[PDB]
Design an enzyme around this catalytic site. Structure first.
Site, PDB file in Angstrom:
ATOM      1  N   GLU A 266      -4.199 -10.420  -1.186  1.00 28.85           N
ATOM      2  CA  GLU A 266      -5.092 -10.402  -0.095  1.00 28.85           C
ATOM      3  C   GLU A 266      -6.466 -10.827  -0.431  1.00 28.85           C
ATOM      4  O   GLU A 266      -7.111  -9.926  -1.167  1.00 28.85           O
ATOM      5  CB  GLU A 266      -4.851  -9.396   0.786  1.00 28.85           C
ATOM      6  CG  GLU A 266      -3.469  -8.839   1.198  1.00 28.85           C
ATOM      7  CD  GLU A 266      -3.316  -7.410   1.953  1.00 28.85           C
ATOM      8  OE1 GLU A 266      -2.495  -6.736   1.836  1.00 28.85           O
ATOM      9  OE2 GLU A 266      -4.651  -7.196   2.622  1.00 28.85           O
TER      10      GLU A 266
ATOM     11  N   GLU B  77       0.810  -1.301   0.076  1.00 30.81           N
ATOM     12  CA  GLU B  77       0.028  -0.108  -0.077  1.00 30.81           C
ATOM     13  C   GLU B  77       0.792   1.388  -0.008  1.00 30.81           C
ATOM     14  O   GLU B  77       0.754   2.048   1.161  1.00 30.81           O
ATOM     15  CB  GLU B  77      -1.168   0.025   1.186  1.00 30.81           C
ATOM     16  CG  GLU B  77      -1.195  -1.509   1.531  1.00 30.81           C
ATOM     17  CD  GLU B  77      -2.466  -1.718   2.512  1.00 30.81           C
ATOM     18  OE1 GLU B  77      -2.667  -1.934   3.430  1.00 30.81           O
ATOM     19  OE2 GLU B  77      -3.763  -1.888   1.549  1.00 30.81           O
TER      20      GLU B  77
HETATM   21  O1  LIG Z   1      -7.580  -5.407   8.073  1.00 26.99           O
HETATM   22  C1  LIG Z   1      -7.694  -3.993   7.750  1.00 26.99           C
HETATM   23  C2  LIG Z   1      -7.238  -4.077   6.131  1.00 26.99           C
HETATM   24  O2  LIG Z   1      -7.531  -2.490   5.422  1.00 26.99           O
HETATM   25  C3  LIG Z   1      -7.526  -2.498   4.353  1.00 26.99           C
HETATM   26  O3  LIG Z   1      -7.683  -1.084   3.982  1.00 26.99           O
HETATM   27  C4  LIG Z   1      -9.037  -0.578   3.697  1.00 26.99           C
HETATM   28  C5  LIG Z   1      -9.233  -0.178   5.224  1.00 26.99           C
HETATM   29  O4  LIG Z   1      -9.497  -1.032   6.275  1.00 26.99           O
HETATM   30  C6  LIG Z   1     -10.497   0.888   5.444  1.00 26.99           C
HETATM   31  O5  LIG Z   1     -10.623   1.583   6.580  1.00 26.99           O
HETATM   32  C7  LIG Z   1     -10.339   2.074   4.078  1.00 26.99           C
HETATM   33  O6  LIG Z   1     -11.407   2.750   4.198  1.00 26.99           O
HETATM   34  O7  LIG Z   1     -10.141   1.420   3.023  1.00 26.99           O
HETATM   35  C8  LIG Z   1      -8.889   0.535   2.811  1.00 26.99           C
HETATM   36  C9  LIG Z   1      -8.956   0.125   1.426  1.00 26.99           C
HETATM   37  O8  LIG Z   1      -7.663   0.415   0.835  1.00 26.99           O
HETATM   38  C10 LIG Z   1      -6.253  -2.963   3.801  1.00 26.99           C
HETATM   39  F1  LIG Z   1      -5.986  -2.687   2.347  1.00 26.99           F
HETATM   40  C11 LIG Z   1      -5.675  -4.354   4.124  1.00 26.99           C
HETATM   41  O9  LIG Z   1      -4.474  -4.711   3.733  1.00 26.99           O
HETATM   42  C12 LIG Z   1      -5.888  -4.526   5.599  1.00 26.99           C
HETATM   43  O10 LIG Z   1      -4.909  -3.467   6.179  1.00 26.99           O
HETATM   44 MG   LIG Z   2      -2.291  -0.868   5.786  1.00 30.11          MG
END
Ligand SMILES: OC[C@H]1O[C@@H](O[C@H]2[C@H](O)[C@@H](O)[C@H](O)O[C@@H]2CO)[C@H](F)[C@@H](O)[C@H]1O
Ligand SMILES: [Mg+2]
Ligand SMILES: OC[C@H]1O[C@@H](O[C@H]2[C@H](O)[C@@H](O)[C@H](O)O[C@@H]2CO)[C@H](F)[C@@H](O)[C@H]1O
Ligand SMILES: [Mg+2]
Ligand SMILES: [Mg+2]
Ligand SMILES: [Mg+2]
Ligand code: NA
Ligand code: NA
Ligand code: NA
Ligand code: NA
Lengths: 1021, 204, 203
Positions: free
Chosen positions: B127, B51
């Protein structure tokens, strides 16, 4: 305290590739911070920009550690006042060094030597306080070699590496109103040095401009421009991206306007905030505008059409915060289907490599010079240049943008001396260092239309670091191709096959990094790229032989798109003799060790910017017009891609052995890449014997920005006919009178007398009246005062057995002994006849055999006939002729043959067959490092003084014997000899030049026939 | 094996990754990993991190590896999961049949993704199937697709264990804690809990 | 003197993406330096390899600037004895944080917050002198989060970033026979932090 040297130098940042800068600001295109549109628009001068160039205070130390803390506080007593920018070696502080490959220092990265010459520069200046109130104030070093620390008002500020790019710092927090003081400690060696092994003079100091820039707190931090077109270029899109620094506020706006001189072509306004780019959003602090342009005017080296762009950062109300601008050129560069295209067409690079060098200033550049260069280049048919091998002085780019030259921007990285060459380049550890070097260049120069190709540097092998960087660019700037020669010239790191010194037809199969004949290279299985030589035709001294071979190939193979000659100017420096006389110096001339002698001298022009004769060959081979002759028609072809022959006059003319019989003038009308037919009026059909020749020239009636009116841009000549002479010499009323003696033979006829020594077998003297004519006897000559090319890299210490010179030497050519085999005299009914035969031997071997006949008639002419035999197992001789030292010395030289400049067998296409008359002085070529020179070939008649020679030969004439030339290392040491030295050659070997460190003369130019014949006629008036 | 780089909180996400200035930092992070782990047979794919959007820095690094270690493929999901910086389409959380067309970085149904014009790479989700609490509904849908489409070669579930910590009550009783349980602020509560097993390694 | 905190911390390497390490050796696969084939072959344990894991001395500070020069020389009074390796938050020194996306600190690269929890680790140990005679001796940190400075026998040695990979230094020139002392100053935030925003506990 922490600002203390003691402390600062503690870290030794200059011995750590991990540290390449400290507190240095980010890179970007050129800013002025105009506070008024018009100004920016008309490129006036901004006051937020201030130069600090001028007198400064300097002091030198053998080492950093030897500096005095006081220095920080107080100026020194022993300090000198100096002008900046400059190279300290140029001021006698220490020596400039001249090595090529070998590092000036010991190889032990990342360690530099304990004794590392330090230059303490200091400057006291005043600052307006208004500046001190609001905004931001930073300083800018356009160029400091190699590394350095900086202090302001006693306070430590930052550090920087990379001698070729700018360094910026925010002074805002160290400035006091009124008087301030800068203290810059500069160092010769640094870890950066390991990446700066260019074959050039090794110097140091603050060699580029110094300035101050006043910018608003909320300002334009960066901007990029891009052009896109429709399939036919009838419409474009200007796309600009702008970034700001500061306080983001919704009333901020950006306006971008395009101008065509006086006219505003397009404008656009908007507020910050970009399009979504990823899951988190976009850039709030950026904005991109897109301007549409109909029927844009394209930029090209042929016609550098430019536009002006203005970036105004202002508020919604209309209040301007600041402005920035730049020149814009509409052009598209792309590689398609194996070809490098520009605006749709396929280029043909007539390039040259060029260093930033001044015989007086060292590495310091200036407008004047730059322009000189540009004009010259343009004048000699060049269209592109390569920044060997670092980014140039900013102004350059502008000039090129303005004048019209394609440029290759090259990163400051050369690790030539490593072993293997990619030792560093393949090491992650050095990655970051390297990166900085590339990235920064890009950020700085990317908006200049003249730049059309990015280059990762030079001679540093091939390493992963390269691949990564190559890629980076590709992603960041897809508008230009990327090239890099290292490691074989065709690696994954280059978009173009860009070798250096590959031959036209001959392969040089070095292990791992062979150099194929360029024609072959193209066809290797799987290969598809275009080929452009990054370096070719080594112009060292009397060179450039073979040049035409390349041009022809270039012209015949689509994928061979040209190259850059090596190189523009000689890297020679001035020195003085006790009589305060200046003279051109080279490697070792400063006691600099180790050094590479003349190797720093490979230009087409002398440091003063005076042309070498080779330049001409270049100009000719690079002409933009090509001719074909068919019967009475001349076919003309345009090698222009974009322009029309709108400033072209074609002059033609016919002559018989130099006698002009007809001339004509015809205006050219040819479309780029088109043909024009030219109908010739009925031609004259002289009766008289001789050679009839046609000659055309192309003239530029009106001056241009880079040329005067009446400039000659191209020429070509043809031999129309020949009228063999069937006449006979009328009878003489008398005949020479022979007279034997023990020592010789005497031929008399009137006031004229000739004598042949019976022991030597040579024509020893001759008189006209009571005047002796020769200071030296007429004799066979088989050698020459070695050219640079003949020598290559052979050294007294380290001899190179394959060098011509070496072979000649070893063969005893230079010291063979002639032996009379026979000498006889005979009286004929109408003349006297002498015959001789000699043998040159060496250590029992017979190298040559020379058999002659001399025949003197009643008309007083002496006809000479020479027939030579050369042992097949001896090395082909440099030449085959005769020589002697004439007692007389005259003003002019007049001949009928190839002229007017020096020309050689493998370098004479640019020469013309005509009647030439010059001053003796002009028959000499002042190559800094002396050797055989000034030859003119294809001569039929030669006149000097009362003398006249006739036949078909080549010759040279001067006041220096070959021996002198051969024995003197610098031009300044030659002294004219007693009379006039004359060399008349029946044949002469080529000069080569494909490279200067191996034998480069092609077989067609070697005297390998085994048997040679020639004749001559000598008389007086 | 994945490099230690996540700039998730930036805005936009690639703010740093697209900056030369950070290049060197990033570099170190990749290069070093490689030098360390390259001789282990178990490592079969290198990854540039997580990310951090997509930036030139990535491209350069991707390339570097390619040159240094051609024995393993390289993947990186940032910036759309199918950039020039990845040898595999490795999205996270793409659905089996349903598309999620976010601007700039849409997540196509995995079956569709494969077929986009010009696409040819294999697809493996970096994932998927967020195992947070009472979850894993739909798992079989993936497996079935995986089994039916050659180019769908699987994925990595998110994730193994809950990231819960122990705390004690006054009676010296231990209990599982999460976001904010240490007065930590700001925090993301239970979000640290997405495993298939409990921290003690007891299965969900 | 130049080994002085006052001086070292002057530069604030931890707020400069340009500095990610100082005097750290180069990376490579795992070495043991066996001096016998069989051993290496059977993966026995090499004696040229020594663990320093165990009890160490720890002390915590709200900021680097609050550290005491004495520290360099002398162990602290208020120092605690701790086991290494470990996470200081796990010992009650400060709190572990749990955010996912949002950075634990304020976003202002490459700046970290003035209050940056510092952990002073120290260790006194003995060195065989045979080692001191010939060869090279280096230390290896398999993992230190997030950044840190290092001293040996009062002398400043190096700096390092990247919590997940090893850091190596050549101690060869700072070792005395017998008793030596290591002083490691570790920091929570650093520019490295900007590259370590994983959704996990911040420790
Ligand atoms: O278990 C947490 C996962 O979160 C994803 O990211 C999300 C995030 O949770 C959310 O709050 C936000 O609004 O959108 C994100 C989408 O990119 C991660 F992408 C996973 O890898 C975990 O970290
Ligand atoms: Mg993250
Ligand atoms: O004008 C000097 C040029 O040297 C070439 O390098 C040669 C070098 O001159 C020679 O001494 C060595 O033996 O071989 C080198 C071939 O790589 C450069 F390649 C040119 O760019 C010039 O520097
Ligand atoms: Mg350094
Ligand atoms: Mg070189
Ligand atoms: Mg740092
Ligand atoms: Na061509
Ligand atoms: Na040279
Ligand atoms: Na499958
Ligand atoms: Na989570």
């Amino acid at each position: 305290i922490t600002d203390s040297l003691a402390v600062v130098l503690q870290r030794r940042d200059w011995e750590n590739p991990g540290v390449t800068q400290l507190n240095r600001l980010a890179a970007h295109p050129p800013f002025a911070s105009w506070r008024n549109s018009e100004e920016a628009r008309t490129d006036r001068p901004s006051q937020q920009l201030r130069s600090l160039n001028g007198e400064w205070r300097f002091a030198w130390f053998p080492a950093p550690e030897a500096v005095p803390e006081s220095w920080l506080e107080c100026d020194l007593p022993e300090a000198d006042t100096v002008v900046v920018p400059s190279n300290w070696q140029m001021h006698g502080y220490d020596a400039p060094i001249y090595t090529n490959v070998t590092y000036p220092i010991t190889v032990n990265p990342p360690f530099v030597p304990t004794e590392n010459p330090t230059g303490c520069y200091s400057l006291t200046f005043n600052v307006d306080e208004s500046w001190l109130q609001e905004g931001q104030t930073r300083i800018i070093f356009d160029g400091v070699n190699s590394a350095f620390h900086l202090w302001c008002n006693g306070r430590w500020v930052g550090y920087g590496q990379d001698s070729r790019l700018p360094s910026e710092f925010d002074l805002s927090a160290f400035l006091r109103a009124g008087e301030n003081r800068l203290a810059v400690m500069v160092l010769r060696w640094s870890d950066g040095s390991y990446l700066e092994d260019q074959d050039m003079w090794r110097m140091s100091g603050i060699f580029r401009d110094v300035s101050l820039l006043h910018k608003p707190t909320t300002q334009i931090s960066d901007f990029h421009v891009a052009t896109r077109f429709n399939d036919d270029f009838s419409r474009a899109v200007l796309e600009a991206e702008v970034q700001m620094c500061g306080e983001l506020r919704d009333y901020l706006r950006v306006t971008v306007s395009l101008w065509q001189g006086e006219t505003q072509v397009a404008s656009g306004t908007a507020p910050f905030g970009g399009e979504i780019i990823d899951e988190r959003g976009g850039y709030a602090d950026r904005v991109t505008l897109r301007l549409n342009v109909e029927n844009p005017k394209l930029w090209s080296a042929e016609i550098p059409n430019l536009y002006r762009a203005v970036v105004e950062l202002h508020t919604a109300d209309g209040t301007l915060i600041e402005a920035e601008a730049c020149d814009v050129g509409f052009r598209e560069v792309r590689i398609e289907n194996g070809l490098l295209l520009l605006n749709g067409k396929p280029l043909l690079i007539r390039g040259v490599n060029r260093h930033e060098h001044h015989p007086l200033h060292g590495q310091v550049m200036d407008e004047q010079t730059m322009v000189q260069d540009i004009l010259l280049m343009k004048q000699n048919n060049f269209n592109a240049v390569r920044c060997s091998h670092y980014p140039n002085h900013p102004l350059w780019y502008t000039l090129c943008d303005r004048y019209g030259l394609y440029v290759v921007d090259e990163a400051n990285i050369e690790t030539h001396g490593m072993v293997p060459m990619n030792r560093l380049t393949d090491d992650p550890r050095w990655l970051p260092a390297m990166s900085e070097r590339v990235t920064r260049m890009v950020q700085r120069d990317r908006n200049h239309p003249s730049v059309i190709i990015w280059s990762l540097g030079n001679e540093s092998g091939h390493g992963a670091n390269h691949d990564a960087l190559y890629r980076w660019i590709k992603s960041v700037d897809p508008s230009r191709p990327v090239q890099y020669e290292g490691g074989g010239a065709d690696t994954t790191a280059t978009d173009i096959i860009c070798p250096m010194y590959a031959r036209v037809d001959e392969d040089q199969p070095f292990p791992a990094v062979p150099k194929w004949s360029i024609k072959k290279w193209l066809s290797l299985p799987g290969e598809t790229r275009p080929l452009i030589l990054c370096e070719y035709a080594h112009a060292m001294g009397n060179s450039l032989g073979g040049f035409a071979k390349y041009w022809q190939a270039f012209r015949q193979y689509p994928r061979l798109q040209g190259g850059f000659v090596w190189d523009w100017v000689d890297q020679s420096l001035i020195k003085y003799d006790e009589n305060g006389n200046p003279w051109s110096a080279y490697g070792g001339d400063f006691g600099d060790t180790p050094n590479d002698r003349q190797f720093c001298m490979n230009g087409l022009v002398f440091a003063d910017r005076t042309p070498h004769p080779a330049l001409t060959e270049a100009k000719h081979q690079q002409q933009f017009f090509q001719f074909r002759l068919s019967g009475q028609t001349i076919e003309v072809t345009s090698e222009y891609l974009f322009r029309h022959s709108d400033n072209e006059l074609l002059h033609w003319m016919v002559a018989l052995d130099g006698k002009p019989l007809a001339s004509g003038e015809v205006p050219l009308d040819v479309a780029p890449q088109g043909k024009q037919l030219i109908e010739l009026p009925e031609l004259p059909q002289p009766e008289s014997a001789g050679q009839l020749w046609l000659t055309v020239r192309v003239v530029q009636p009106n001056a241009t920005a880079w040329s005067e009116a009446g400039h000659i841009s191209a020429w070509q000549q043809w031999r129309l006919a020949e009228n063999l002479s069937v006449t006979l010499p009328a009878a003489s009323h008398a005949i020479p009178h022979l007279t034997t003696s023990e020592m010789d033979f005497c031929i008399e006829l009137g006031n004229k007398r000739w004598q042949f020594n019976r022991q030597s077998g040579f024509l020893s003297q001759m008189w006209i009246g009571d005047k002796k004519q020769l200071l030296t006897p007429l004799r066979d000559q088989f050698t020459r005062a070695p050219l640079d090319n003949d020598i290559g890299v052979s050294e007294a210490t380290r001899i190179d057995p394959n060098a011509w010179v070496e072979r000649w030497k070893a063969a005893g050519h230079y010291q063979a002994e002639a032996a009379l085999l026979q000498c006889t005299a005979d009286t004929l009914a109408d003349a006297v006849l002498i015959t001789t035969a000699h043998a040159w031997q060496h250590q029992g071997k017979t190298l040559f055999i020379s058999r002659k006949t001399y025949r003197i008639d009643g008309s007083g002419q002496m006809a000479i006939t020479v027939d030579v035999e050369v042992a097949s197992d001896t090395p082909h001789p440099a030449r085959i002729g005769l020589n002697c030292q004439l007692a007389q010395v005259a003003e002019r030289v007049n001949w009928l043959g190839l002229g007017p400049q020096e020309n050689y067998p493998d370098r004479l296409t640019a020469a013309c067959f005509d009647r030439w008359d010059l001053p003796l002085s002009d028959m000499y070529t002042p190559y800094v490092f002396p050797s055989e020179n000034g030859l003119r070939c294809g001569t039929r008649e030669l006149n000097y003084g009362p003398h006249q020679w006739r036949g078909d030969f080549q010759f040279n004439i001067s006041r220096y014997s070959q021996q002198q030339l051969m024995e003197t290392s610098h031009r300044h040491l030659l002294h004219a000899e007693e009379g006039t030295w004359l060399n008349i050659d029946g044949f002469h070997m080529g000069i080569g030049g494909d490279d200067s460190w191996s034998p480069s003369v092609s077989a067609e130019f070697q005297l390998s026939a085994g048997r040679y014949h020639y004749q001559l006629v000598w008389c007086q008036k």
